[PDB]
Amino acid sequence: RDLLSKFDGLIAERQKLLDSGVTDPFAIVMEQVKSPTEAVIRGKDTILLGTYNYMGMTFDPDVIAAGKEALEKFGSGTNGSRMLNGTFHDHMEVEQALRDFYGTTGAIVFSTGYMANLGIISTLAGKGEYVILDADSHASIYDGCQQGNAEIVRFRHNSVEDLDKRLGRLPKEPAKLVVLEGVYSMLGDIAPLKEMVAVAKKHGAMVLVDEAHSMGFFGPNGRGVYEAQGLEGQIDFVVGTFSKSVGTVGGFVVSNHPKFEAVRLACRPYIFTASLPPSVVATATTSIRKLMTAHEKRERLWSNARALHGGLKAMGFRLGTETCDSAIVAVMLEDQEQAAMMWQALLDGGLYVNMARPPATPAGTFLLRCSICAEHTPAQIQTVLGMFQAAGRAVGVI
Amino acid sequence: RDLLSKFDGLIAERQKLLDSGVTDPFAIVMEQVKSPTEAVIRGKDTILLGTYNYMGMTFDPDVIAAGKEALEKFGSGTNGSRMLNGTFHDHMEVEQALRDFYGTTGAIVFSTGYMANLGIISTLAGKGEYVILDADSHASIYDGCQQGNAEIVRFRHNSVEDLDKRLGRLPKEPAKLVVLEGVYSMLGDIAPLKEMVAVAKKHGAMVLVDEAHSMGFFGPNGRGVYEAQGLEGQIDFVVGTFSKSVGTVGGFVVSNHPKFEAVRLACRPYIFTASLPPSVVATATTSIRKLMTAHEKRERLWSNARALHGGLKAMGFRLGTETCDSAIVAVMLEDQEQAAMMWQALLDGGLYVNMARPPATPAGTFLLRCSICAEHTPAQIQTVLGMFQAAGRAVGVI
Ligand SMILES: Cc1ncc(COP(=O)(O)O)c(CN)c1O
Ligand SMILES: Cc1ncc(COP(=O)(O)O)c(CN)c1O
Ligand SMILES: [Mg+2]
Ligand SMILES: [Mg+2]
């Protein structure tokens, strides 16, 4: 035995899945990507319905031009930390774009969203302090908790009551960080932020909200679920990503706290990594600024989401949500076999969706997760519904 | 008090530095970057001598063209994990480029070097196992240890003897990971890998070597210090980055272990983050492949390093190394004031180098760290030496 013997189980589990005859879901390659909604997979033209490209920004002509210009003018990389030689013109631009987008004085960009969560959580809450989070929080949030030295307080998923009871049992004096997500990514339902933030404030906690799955399409300014629920000016920190609506790679945290920018001085995942390439921060800047006023896209996105959600529910699919509350539509299946058969039938018929099985999901939960794009056409959505009808019948789901 | 009160000290320390009249070293902006060796900083044309762009790849015409083509053909981002919708043509290309570069069957790319270290260390060594590392290891290596659940065994910096004694006191049966760096980044000296790896193998440990600071210019194939020291086929895992010689952003681990690619199934910083943008992996692929045969650049790099090292030592600067052993030349100063005065004089005269002061360095260590580029000209290196002579005299260092 050696250090890799611990993976023998996972290797066996993968081979068991492949023995069923399914395409390996963890090894899909997009050989060509024609647009935000169309790819070539296994040599076949395929509609994409499993990406987080919510606003279709990845092929936006201004975004692409900004990226090409940055490569030409600044080269392929920075070869340094933000605290040394890695801050170029476009890094200052992208942080200002975020300030303008969120209406905040503070904005700190990280090289990934994962690192933003890892860093901000492990840096803000120290020994003797508390991080309070939903039981089903994103892995990066849990990993931030593990990286830090704070006391970790999980509360029952989606429970305002358990948040209140758990917070109330903590000592009053130590500082506390309540970490929430606007959209629950697994099923695409929405957190009761208004109520949970009121509870957080009652107990004197600071609040961090992750608005990765809402950027550009919730709230009057597209700032997220917190904005939609009337919490402007009440959220201490908002964390997000450049990899979803923005369409590149990177993370960020914004805040109006007067000492916020001091996080740069302490935050290990900010300090000890190269800054993002000029092209990445240039594309992000352009995308973020366009997202501030991307009303046509926002309306299309929601129209598409409502059509897909409404259509799938009407056919008799069990969905994760009764109403269309986000750009994620989760189809719930009875067992792992049904999920894989559905996923393969859709793929072979020209549609890519994400499958989620245990341990990605909780035991007994087997999902196809569809994610809508502003650049899906009404025609594509009807084609997708037709494909779900055909696959659902062939497999015996509906 | 709140969660940010803990930064009051760092805020005060920064203000104390600025009270001396120095430019804030942590807020330098490259307003224009003309080439790998020339920038505009504070409106002034400045020679760059503080980047990790060792092989000058960031303005390579093939690298830039590959990046522009990828933006055009695949868009600005992937909007997904490598385990789902985020693996495009160019991600498969970059992993194959690494296999070819290192002569390995296995290659796993991460979204940053930081995350590669964080992930590989915390995933390979579990509860009841051991990670053995140099006391002065890179922050990302320490952060990987913190993220995991293994027993952490520090050994005295650069001590083959302490590595041997510390390893030998551990129980024999549990699996062990010895983590080493080829180049010690602070002073630019080289690890005794041949001897330390022999010790690791005597005790049955697996070995991970970080070759971030050696890629393309140590060993016959440019694979790193381990290759230069004759250890081909003896290193279980090599970790690296795309942000230094390669000239973009990203991390990787390569290996010939038959179960290596199973790490994808378990590694949280691989799974729970978006993959790199098409342009980033395209530029990396092109750069990595060119680095395999970049002999002119390699010779220039070493010629430049020898000239700078030899020149600075001849003037009476105390260097971190007696001989030119890497592309980092560290100038050691007597106190923090001398370092800042030297750094400012160089900057005002048209030269950027990195300053390192406590707590970045150990107490009593005050450095200017110069990093050479293959695209520095002999003329630039002599200009730099002249600037060091003038600054060193004006400040009273030499
Ligand atoms: C809610 C949430 N927060 C943070 C992240 C991390 O973002 P990134 O992909 O930029 O690392 C993710 C990744 N899907 C996420 O879903
Ligand atoms: C030795 C070493 N290893 C790993 C890293 C992390 O690499 P990256 O900048 O790609 O995150 C660094 C960052 N300087 C490093 O110096
Ligand atoms: Mg095209
Ligand atoms: Mg130019």
Side-chain angles (χ1 to χ4, degrees):
Chain A
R1 290 180 74 85
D2 61 20
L3 291 170
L4 289 89
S5 296
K6 63 173 59 61
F7 307 122
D8 289 348
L10 294 169
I11 289 164
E13 285 168 4
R14 174 176 59 182
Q15 185 50 53
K16 189 181 172 178
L17 173 62
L18 295 180
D19 283 357
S20 74
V22 71
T23 308
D24 186 348
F26 296 164
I28 291 290
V29 180
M30 310 300 180
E31 264 307 309
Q32 303 170 40
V33 178
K34 299 185 174 181
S35 77
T37 66
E38 305 155 87
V40 178
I41 302 176
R42 300 151 74 239
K44 304 169 190 67
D45 290 343
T46 303
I47 295 172
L48 295 173
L49 196 67
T51 86
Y52 294 134
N53 197 8
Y54 292 123
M55 293 289 279
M57 300 306 290
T58 57
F59 282 85
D60 177 278
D62 296 302
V63 173
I64 293 309
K68 292 183 184 177
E69 176 188 270
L71 279 160
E72 176 66 19
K73 289 167 65 168
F74 288 93
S76 63
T78 67
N79 322 93
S81 173
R82 290 294 306 280
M83 295 300 269
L84 290 173
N85 58 293
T87 299
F88 291 14
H89 173 78
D90 287 302
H91 301 80
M92 300 299 287
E93 296 299 321
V94 77
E95 284 174 343
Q96 193 59 46
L98 286 165
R99 291 188 191 92
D100 292 353
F101 189 95
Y102 286 100
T104 57
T105 53
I108 299 171
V109 166
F110 293 77
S111 294
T112 65
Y114 177 97
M115 288 167 76
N117 270 327
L118 185 83
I120 202 67
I121 293 165
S122 63
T123 305
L124 286 179
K127 276 259 164 45
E129 296 174 336
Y130 295 86
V131 180
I132 304 95
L133 77 168
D134 190 283
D136 299 344
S137 295
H138 191 256
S140 64
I141 293 168
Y142 270 109
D143 287 2
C145 292
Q146 171 65 24
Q147 187 62 30
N149 304 117
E151 300 299 300
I152 308 311
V153 187
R154 301 180 297 169
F155 68 87
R156 182 169 61 253
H157 176 62
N158 200 30
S159 182
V160 179
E161 189 151 16
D162 200 44
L163 173 59
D164 197 2
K165 292 297 185 190
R166 292 277 274 160
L167 272 172
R169 282 177 208 117
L170 305 181
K172 305 313 174 302
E173 198 158 319
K176 303 175 184 69
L177 186 64
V178 172
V179 182
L180 306 172
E181 290 174 71
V183 177
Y184 301 134
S185 60
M186 187 178 68
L187 301 182
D189 50 330
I190 300 297
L193 293 185
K194 184 179 165 184
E195 292 76 15
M196 289 181 164
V197 171
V199 163
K201 287 185 184 302
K202 184 175 67 162
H203 296 283
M206 307 193 85
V207 177
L208 169 67
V209 184
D210 183 324
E211 295 282 7
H213 283 291
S214 61
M215 189 180 190
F217 60 100
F218 283 80
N221 292 287
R223 293 167 186 169
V225 178
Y226 80 94
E227 195 197 9
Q229 295 189 11
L231 302 168
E232 191 57 78
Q234 293 197 63
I235 305 304
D236 302 280
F237 318 98
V238 171
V239 59
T241 180
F242 291 170
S243 69
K244 300 190 177 49
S245 303
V246 174
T248 181
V249 73
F252 65 84
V253 185
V254 294
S255 183
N256 285 309
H257 192 288
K259 298 178 186 172
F260 179 64
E261 300 253 338
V263 166
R264 297 186 203 274
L265 300 169
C267 188
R268 292 168 64 87
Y270 180 80
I271 297 161
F272 292 109
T273 196
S275 69
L276 291 166
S279 71
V280 168
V281 285
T283 57
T285 296
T286 297
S287 185
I288 290 161
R289 288 193 179 281
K290 289 194 76 170
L291 284 171
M292 294 183 59
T293 63
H295 299 296
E296 179 184 13
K297 283 167 175 286
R298 180 173 172 161
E299 293 301 302
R300 292 186 59 144
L301 176 55
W302 280 110
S303 177
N304 289 342
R306 292 184 203 110
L308 183 67
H309 188 284
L312 290 179
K313 190 183 181 169
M315 278 173 210
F317 287 107
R318 182 187 189 199
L319 302 188
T321 48
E322 284 294 323
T323 55
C324 182
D325 302 340
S326 74
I328 293 158
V329 180
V331 172
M332 303 180 75
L333 298 166
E334 287 186 59
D335 55 52
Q336 201 179 166
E337 187 183 15
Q338 198 175 66
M341 287 180 68
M342 271 297 286
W343 179 79
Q344 189 69 51
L346 292 171
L347 191 65
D348 290 344
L351 182 62
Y352 177 84
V353 301
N354 290 315
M355 179 166 52
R357 292 153 37 254
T361 60
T365 296
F366 316 93
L367 307 178
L368 307 177
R369 294 175 59 263
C370 304
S371 40
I372 302 96
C373 181
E375 299 302 325
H376 282 117
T377 62
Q380 282 176 313
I381 297 296
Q382 288 311 142
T383 297
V384 165
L385 287 168
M387 290 173 173
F388 264 93
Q389 192 222 43
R393 281 160 132 178
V395 179
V397 181
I398 59 172
Chain B
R1 290 180 74 85
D2 61 20
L3 291 170
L4 289 89
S5 296
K6 63 173 59 61
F7 307 122
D8 289 348
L10 294 169
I11 289 164
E13 285 168 4
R14 174 176 59 182
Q15 185 50 53
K16 189 181 172 178
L17 173 62
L18 295 180
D19 283 357
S20 74
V22 71
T23 308
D24 186 348
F26 296 164
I28 291 290
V29 180
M30 310 300 180
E31 264 307 309
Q32 303 170 40
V33 178
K34 299 185 174 181
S35 77
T37 66
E38 305 155 87
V40 178
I41 302 176
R42 300 151 74 239
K44 304 169 190 67
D45 290 343
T46 303
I47 295 172
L48 295 173
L49 196 67
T51 86
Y52 294 134
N53 197 8
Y54 292 123
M55 293 289 279
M57 300 306 290
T58 57
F59 282 85
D60 177 278
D62 296 302
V63 173
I64 293 309
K68 292 183 184 177
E69 176 188 270
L71 279 160
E72 176 66 19
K73 289 167 65 168
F74 288 93
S76 63
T78 67
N79 322 93
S81 173
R82 290 294 306 280
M83 295 300 269
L84 290 173
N85 58 293
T87 299
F88 291 14
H89 173 78
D90 287 302
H91 301 80
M92 300 299 287
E93 296 299 321
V94 77
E95 284 174 343
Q96 193 59 46
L98 286 165
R99 291 188 191 92
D100 292 353
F101 189 95
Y102 286 100
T104 57
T105 53
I108 299 171
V109 166
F110 293 77
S111 294
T112 65
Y114 177 97
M115 288 167 76
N117 270 327
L118 185 83
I120 202 67
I121 293 165
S122 63
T123 305
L124 286 179
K127 276 259 164 45
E129 296 174 336
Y130 295 86
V131 180
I132 304 95
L133 77 168
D134 190 283
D136 299 344
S137 295
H138 191 256
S140 64
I141 293 168
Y142 270 109
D143 287 2
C145 292
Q146 171 65 24
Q147 187 62 30
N149 304 117
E151 300 299 300
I152 308 311
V153 187
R154 301 180 297 169
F155 68 87
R156 182 169 61 253
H157 176 62
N158 200 30
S159 182
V160 179
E161 189 151 16
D162 200 44
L163 173 59
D164 197 2
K165 292 297 185 190
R166 292 277 274 160
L167 272 172
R169 282 177 208 117
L170 305 181
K172 305 313 174 302
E173 198 158 319
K176 303 175 184 69
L177 186 64
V178 172
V179 182
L180 306 172
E181 290 174 71
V183 177
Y184 301 134
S185 60
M186 187 178 68
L187 301 182
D189 50 330
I190 300 297
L193 293 185
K194 184 179 165 184
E195 292 76 15
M196 289 181 164
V197 171
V199 163
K201 287 185 184 302
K202 184 175 67 162
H203 296 283
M206 307 193 85
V207 177
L208 169 67
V209 184
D210 183 324
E211 295 282 7
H213 283 291
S214 61
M215 189 180 190
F217 60 100
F218 283 80
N221 292 287
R223 293 167 186 169
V225 178
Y226 80 94
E227 195 197 9
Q229 295 189 11
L231 302 168
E232 191 57 78
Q234 293 197 63
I235 305 304
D236 302 280
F237 318 98
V238 171
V239 59
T241 180
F242 291 170
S243 69
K244 300 190 177 49
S245 303
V246 174
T248 181
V249 73
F252 65 84
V253 185
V254 294
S255 183
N256 285 309
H257 192 288
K259 298 178 186 172
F260 179 64
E261 300 253 338
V263 166
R264 297 186 203 274
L265 300 169
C267 188
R268 292 168 64 87
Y270 180 80
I271 297 161
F272 292 109
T273 196
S275 69
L276 291 166
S279 71
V280 168
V281 285
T283 57
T285 296
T286 297
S287 185
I288 290 161
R289 288 193 179 281
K290 289 194 76 170
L291 284 171
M292 294 183 59
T293 63
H295 299 296
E296 179 184 13
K297 283 167 175 286
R298 180 173 172 161
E299 293 301 302
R300 292 186 59 144
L301 176 55
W302 280 110
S303 177
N304 289 342
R306 292 184 203 110
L308 183 67
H309 188 284
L312 290 179
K313 190 183 181 169
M315 278 173 210
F317 287 107
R318 182 187 189 199
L319 302 188
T321 48
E322 284 294 323
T323 55
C324 182
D325 302 340
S326 74
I328 293 158
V329 180
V331 172
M332 303 180 75
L333 298 166
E334 287 186 59
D335 55 52
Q336 201 179 166
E337 187 183 15
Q338 198 175 66
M341 287 180 68
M342 271 297 286
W343 179 79
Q344 189 69 51
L346 292 171
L347 191 65
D348 290 344
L351 182 62
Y352 177 84
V353 301
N354 290 315
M355 179 166 52
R357 292 153 37 254
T361 60
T365 296
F366 316 93
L367 307 178
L368 307 177
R369 294 175 59 263
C370 304
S371 40
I372 302 96
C373 181
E375 299 302 325
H376 282 117
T377 62
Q380 282 176 313
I381 297 296
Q382 288 311 142
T383 297
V384 165
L385 287 168
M387 290 173 173
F388 264 93
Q389 192 222 43
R393 281 160 132 178
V395 179
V397 181
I398 59 172

Short mmCIF file of all heavy atoms in Angstrom, two decimals, chain A residues 52 111-117 138-141 181 183 185 210-213 239-244 248-251, chain B residues 80-81 111 115 271-275, ligand 1:
data_model
loop_
_atom_site.label_atom_id
_atom_site.label_comp_id
_atom_site.label_asym_id
_atom_site.label_seq_id
_atom_site.Cartn_x
_atom_site.Cartn_y
_atom_site.Cartn_z
N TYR A 52 -22.70 27.27 -16.44
CA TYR A 52 -23.09 28.41 -15.61
C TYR A 52 -22.89 29.74 -16.34
O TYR A 52 -22.69 30.77 -15.71
CB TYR A 52 -22.34 28.38 -14.27
CG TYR A 52 -22.71 27.21 -13.39
CD1 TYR A 52 -21.72 26.47 -12.76
CD2 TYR A 52 -24.04 26.87 -13.15
CE1 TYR A 52 -22.03 25.40 -11.93
CE2 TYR A 52 -24.37 25.79 -12.33
CZ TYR A 52 -23.35 25.06 -11.72
OH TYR A 52 -23.65 24.00 -10.90
N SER A 111 -7.65 34.92 -7.46
CA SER A 111 -7.40 34.20 -8.70
C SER A 111 -8.47 33.14 -9.01
O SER A 111 -8.60 32.76 -10.16
CB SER A 111 -5.97 33.64 -8.72
OG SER A 111 -5.09 34.75 -8.76
N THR A 112 -9.25 32.71 -8.01
CA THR A 112 -10.46 31.90 -8.25
C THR A 112 -11.51 32.25 -7.20
O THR A 112 -11.18 32.77 -6.14
CB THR A 112 -10.21 30.38 -8.16
OG1 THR A 112 -9.84 30.04 -6.81
CG2 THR A 112 -9.12 29.92 -9.14
N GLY A 113 -12.78 31.94 -7.51
CA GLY A 113 -13.85 32.02 -6.52
C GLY A 113 -13.60 31.10 -5.34
O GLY A 113 -13.81 31.48 -4.18
N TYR A 114 -13.12 29.90 -5.63
CA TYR A 114 -12.76 28.97 -4.56
C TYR A 114 -11.81 29.62 -3.56
O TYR A 114 -12.01 29.53 -2.34
CB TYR A 114 -12.14 27.70 -5.18
CG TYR A 114 -11.69 26.69 -4.15
CD1 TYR A 114 -12.49 25.61 -3.79
CD2 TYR A 114 -10.45 26.82 -3.52
CE1 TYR A 114 -12.06 24.69 -2.82
CE2 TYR A 114 -10.03 25.92 -2.57
CZ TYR A 114 -10.83 24.88 -2.22
OH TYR A 114 -10.38 24.00 -1.25
N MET A 115 -10.75 30.26 -4.06
CA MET A 115 -9.76 30.93 -3.20
C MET A 115 -10.32 32.15 -2.48
O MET A 115 -9.90 32.44 -1.37
CB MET A 115 -8.51 31.30 -4.02
CG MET A 115 -7.66 30.08 -4.39
SD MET A 115 -6.41 30.38 -5.65
CE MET A 115 -5.18 31.25 -4.71
N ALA A 116 -11.26 32.85 -3.10
CA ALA A 116 -11.94 33.97 -2.43
C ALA A 116 -12.67 33.47 -1.18
O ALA A 116 -12.53 34.06 -0.11
CB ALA A 116 -12.90 34.67 -3.38
N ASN A 117 -13.45 32.40 -1.32
CA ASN A 117 -14.12 31.83 -0.15
C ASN A 117 -13.13 31.25 0.85
O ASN A 117 -13.23 31.51 2.06
CB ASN A 117 -15.15 30.78 -0.55
CG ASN A 117 -16.52 31.37 -0.77
OD1 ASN A 117 -16.90 32.35 -0.12
ND2 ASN A 117 -17.27 30.80 -1.70
N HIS A 138 -21.64 25.38 0.00
CA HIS A 138 -20.68 25.01 -1.04
C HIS A 138 -19.36 24.52 -0.45
O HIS A 138 -18.91 25.01 0.59
CB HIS A 138 -20.38 26.19 -1.97
CG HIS A 138 -19.60 25.80 -3.19
ND1 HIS A 138 -18.26 26.07 -3.34
CD2 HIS A 138 -19.97 25.10 -4.29
CE1 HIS A 138 -17.84 25.58 -4.49
NE2 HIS A 138 -18.86 24.99 -5.09
N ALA A 139 -18.75 23.56 -1.13
CA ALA A 139 -17.48 22.99 -0.68
C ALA A 139 -16.43 24.04 -0.35
O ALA A 139 -15.69 23.88 0.62
CB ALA A 139 -16.93 22.04 -1.74
N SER A 140 -16.34 25.12 -1.14
CA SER A 140 -15.32 26.14 -0.91
C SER A 140 -15.52 26.87 0.42
O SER A 140 -14.56 27.32 1.03
CB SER A 140 -15.25 27.15 -2.07
OG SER A 140 -16.45 27.89 -2.20
N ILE A 141 -16.77 26.98 0.85
CA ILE A 141 -17.11 27.61 2.12
C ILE A 141 -16.66 26.70 3.27
O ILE A 141 -15.99 27.15 4.20
CB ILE A 141 -18.61 27.94 2.21
CG1 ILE A 141 -18.96 29.04 1.19
CG2 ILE A 141 -18.99 28.38 3.63
CD1 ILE A 141 -20.45 29.27 0.98
N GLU A 181 -25.68 31.59 1.22
CA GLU A 181 -25.71 31.60 -0.23
C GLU A 181 -27.08 32.10 -0.65
O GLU A 181 -28.08 31.72 -0.05
CB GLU A 181 -25.46 30.20 -0.78
CG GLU A 181 -24.02 29.73 -0.57
CD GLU A 181 -23.80 28.29 -0.99
OE1 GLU A 181 -23.80 28.00 -2.20
OE2 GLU A 181 -23.61 27.45 -0.10
N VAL A 183 -28.62 31.57 -3.77
CA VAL A 183 -29.23 30.45 -4.47
C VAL A 183 -28.62 29.15 -3.96
O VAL A 183 -27.40 29.04 -3.85
CB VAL A 183 -28.99 30.57 -5.98
CG1 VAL A 183 -29.57 29.38 -6.72
CG2 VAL A 183 -29.57 31.86 -6.51
N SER A 185 -27.46 25.83 -4.90
CA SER A 185 -27.06 25.36 -6.23
C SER A 185 -27.58 23.98 -6.62
O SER A 185 -27.81 23.71 -7.81
CB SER A 185 -25.54 25.39 -6.37
OG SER A 185 -24.93 24.56 -5.40
N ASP A 210 -22.74 34.70 -0.51
CA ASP A 210 -22.20 34.24 -1.78
C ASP A 210 -23.29 34.39 -2.84
O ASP A 210 -24.34 33.77 -2.76
CB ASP A 210 -21.74 32.78 -1.61
CG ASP A 210 -21.08 32.20 -2.86
OD1 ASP A 210 -21.52 32.52 -3.97
OD2 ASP A 210 -20.12 31.38 -2.71
N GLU A 211 -23.05 35.27 -3.81
CA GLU A 211 -24.00 35.55 -4.88
C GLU A 211 -23.44 35.11 -6.23
O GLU A 211 -23.66 35.76 -7.25
CB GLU A 211 -24.38 37.04 -4.87
CG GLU A 211 -25.13 37.46 -3.60
CD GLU A 211 -26.61 37.08 -3.58
OE1 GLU A 211 -27.10 36.36 -4.49
OE2 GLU A 211 -27.31 37.52 -2.64
N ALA A 212 -22.75 33.98 -6.24
CA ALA A 212 -22.22 33.38 -7.47
C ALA A 212 -23.30 33.02 -8.49
O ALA A 212 -23.11 33.19 -9.69
CB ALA A 212 -21.40 32.17 -7.15
N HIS A 213 -24.45 32.54 -8.02
CA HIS A 213 -25.48 32.00 -8.91
C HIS A 213 -26.59 33.00 -9.22
O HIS A 213 -27.64 32.62 -9.72
CB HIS A 213 -26.05 30.72 -8.30
CG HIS A 213 -25.15 29.54 -8.46
ND1 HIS A 213 -24.91 28.96 -9.69
CD2 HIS A 213 -24.43 28.83 -7.56
CE1 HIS A 213 -24.09 27.93 -9.53
NE2 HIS A 213 -23.79 27.83 -8.25
N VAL A 239 -19.45 37.78 -1.59
CA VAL A 239 -18.45 37.02 -2.32
C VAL A 239 -19.06 36.55 -3.64
O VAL A 239 -20.24 36.29 -3.75
CB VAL A 239 -17.86 35.85 -1.47
CG1 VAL A 239 -18.93 34.87 -1.02
CG2 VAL A 239 -16.77 35.12 -2.23
N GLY A 240 -18.22 36.50 -4.67
CA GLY A 240 -18.64 36.02 -5.95
C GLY A 240 -17.50 35.49 -6.77
O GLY A 240 -16.37 35.32 -6.29
N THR A 241 -17.83 35.23 -8.02
CA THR A 241 -16.93 34.59 -8.95
C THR A 241 -17.00 35.30 -10.29
O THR A 241 -17.99 35.97 -10.61
CB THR A 241 -17.29 33.10 -9.13
OG1 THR A 241 -16.39 32.50 -10.06
CG2 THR A 241 -18.71 32.92 -9.64
N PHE A 242 -15.93 35.15 -11.06
CA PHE A 242 -15.91 35.57 -12.45
C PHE A 242 -16.28 34.42 -13.39
O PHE A 242 -16.33 34.63 -14.60
CB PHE A 242 -14.52 36.04 -12.85
CG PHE A 242 -14.06 37.33 -12.22
CD1 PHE A 242 -12.74 37.71 -12.37
CD2 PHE A 242 -14.92 38.18 -11.54
CE1 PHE A 242 -12.27 38.87 -11.83
CE2 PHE A 242 -14.44 39.36 -10.99
CZ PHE A 242 -13.11 39.70 -11.16
N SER A 243 -16.51 33.21 -12.87
CA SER A 243 -16.64 32.05 -13.75
C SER A 243 -18.04 31.73 -14.22
O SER A 243 -18.19 30.88 -15.07
CB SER A 243 -16.02 30.79 -13.13
OG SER A 243 -16.75 30.33 -12.02
N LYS A 244 -19.06 32.40 -13.68
CA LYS A 244 -20.43 32.11 -14.04
C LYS A 244 -20.93 33.20 -14.98
O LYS A 244 -20.51 33.24 -16.13
CB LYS A 244 -21.28 31.89 -12.79
CG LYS A 244 -20.74 30.72 -11.96
CD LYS A 244 -21.66 30.30 -10.83
CE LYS A 244 -21.10 29.10 -10.09
NZ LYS A 244 -19.68 29.26 -9.72
N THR A 248 -15.36 34.25 -17.18
CA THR A 248 -13.93 33.96 -17.23
C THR A 248 -13.51 33.10 -16.06
O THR A 248 -14.05 32.02 -15.91
CB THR A 248 -13.05 35.21 -17.46
OG1 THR A 248 -11.67 34.80 -17.53
CG2 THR A 248 -13.28 36.27 -16.39
N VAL A 249 -12.50 33.50 -15.30
CA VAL A 249 -12.09 32.82 -14.08
C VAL A 249 -11.67 33.88 -13.08
O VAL A 249 -11.23 34.96 -13.46
CB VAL A 249 -10.95 31.81 -14.36
CG1 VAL A 249 -9.61 32.52 -14.64
CG2 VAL A 249 -10.82 30.81 -13.25
N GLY A 250 -11.82 33.59 -11.80
CA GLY A 250 -11.48 34.53 -10.75
C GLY A 250 -12.54 34.58 -9.67
O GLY A 250 -13.65 34.07 -9.84
N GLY A 251 -12.17 35.18 -8.55
CA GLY A 251 -13.10 35.38 -7.44
C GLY A 251 -13.03 36.80 -6.94
O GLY A 251 -12.13 37.56 -7.27
N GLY B 80 -17.53 26.17 -15.86
CA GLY B 80 -17.74 24.87 -15.24
C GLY B 80 -16.49 24.16 -14.77
O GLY B 80 -15.38 24.43 -15.23
N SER B 81 -16.71 23.21 -13.88
CA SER B 81 -15.68 22.34 -13.36
C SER B 81 -15.14 21.39 -14.43
O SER B 81 -15.87 20.99 -15.33
CB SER B 81 -16.28 21.50 -12.24
OG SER B 81 -15.39 20.50 -11.77
N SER B 111 -6.52 25.22 -11.28
CA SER B 111 -6.74 26.60 -11.70
C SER B 111 -5.67 27.57 -11.17
O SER B 111 -5.51 28.64 -11.75
CB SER B 111 -8.17 27.03 -11.37
OG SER B 111 -9.04 26.26 -12.19
N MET B 115 -3.55 26.25 -5.53
CA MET B 115 -4.56 25.19 -5.39
C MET B 115 -4.01 23.80 -5.68
O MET B 115 -4.46 22.83 -5.09
CB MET B 115 -5.78 25.50 -6.27
CG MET B 115 -6.64 26.65 -5.74
SD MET B 115 -7.85 27.30 -6.89
CE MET B 115 -9.10 26.04 -6.84
N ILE B 271 -12.07 19.70 -8.08
CA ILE B 271 -13.47 19.48 -8.40
C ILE B 271 -14.32 20.75 -8.31
O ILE B 271 -15.13 21.05 -9.19
CB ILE B 271 -14.07 18.40 -7.47
CG1 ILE B 271 -13.38 17.04 -7.68
CG2 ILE B 271 -15.58 18.26 -7.69
CD1 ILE B 271 -13.58 16.08 -6.53
N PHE B 272 -14.13 21.52 -7.25
CA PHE B 272 -15.10 22.55 -6.85
C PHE B 272 -14.71 23.97 -7.25
O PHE B 272 -14.90 24.92 -6.48
CB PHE B 272 -15.33 22.44 -5.35
CG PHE B 272 -16.05 21.18 -4.95
CD1 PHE B 272 -15.40 20.16 -4.28
CD2 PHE B 272 -17.38 21.02 -5.26
CE1 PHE B 272 -16.07 19.00 -3.92
CE2 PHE B 272 -18.07 19.86 -4.90
CZ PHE B 272 -17.41 18.85 -4.23
N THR B 273 -14.23 24.09 -8.47
CA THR B 273 -13.81 25.36 -9.03
C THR B 273 -13.94 25.26 -10.55
O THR B 273 -13.87 24.16 -11.12
CB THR B 273 -12.36 25.69 -8.61
OG1 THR B 273 -12.09 27.08 -8.85
CG2 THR B 273 -11.35 24.85 -9.36
N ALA B 274 -14.14 26.39 -11.20
CA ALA B 274 -14.17 26.42 -12.65
C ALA B 274 -12.80 26.10 -13.22
O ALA B 274 -11.77 26.48 -12.67
CB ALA B 274 -14.65 27.77 -13.15
N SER B 275 -12.79 25.42 -14.35
CA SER B 275 -11.56 25.25 -15.10
C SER B 275 -11.08 26.57 -15.70
O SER B 275 -11.81 27.55 -15.75
CB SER B 275 -11.77 24.22 -16.19
OG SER B 275 -12.64 24.74 -17.17
C1 LIG C 1 -21.75 28.97 -4.71
C2 LIG C 1 -20.34 28.90 -5.23
N1 LIG C 1 -19.40 29.72 -4.66
C3 LIG C 1 -18.11 29.71 -5.07
C4 LIG C 1 -17.71 28.87 -6.11
C5 LIG C 1 -16.26 28.90 -6.54
O1 LIG C 1 -16.16 29.65 -7.73
P1 LIG C 1 -14.99 29.36 -8.80
O2 LIG C 1 -15.48 28.39 -9.86
O3 LIG C 1 -14.75 30.73 -9.38
O4 LIG C 1 -13.77 28.88 -8.09
C6 LIG C 1 -18.64 28.02 -6.71
C7 LIG C 1 -18.18 27.05 -7.79
N2 LIG C 1 -19.30 26.48 -8.49
C8 LIG C 1 -19.97 28.06 -6.27
O5 LIG C 1 -20.92 27.26 -6.85
#
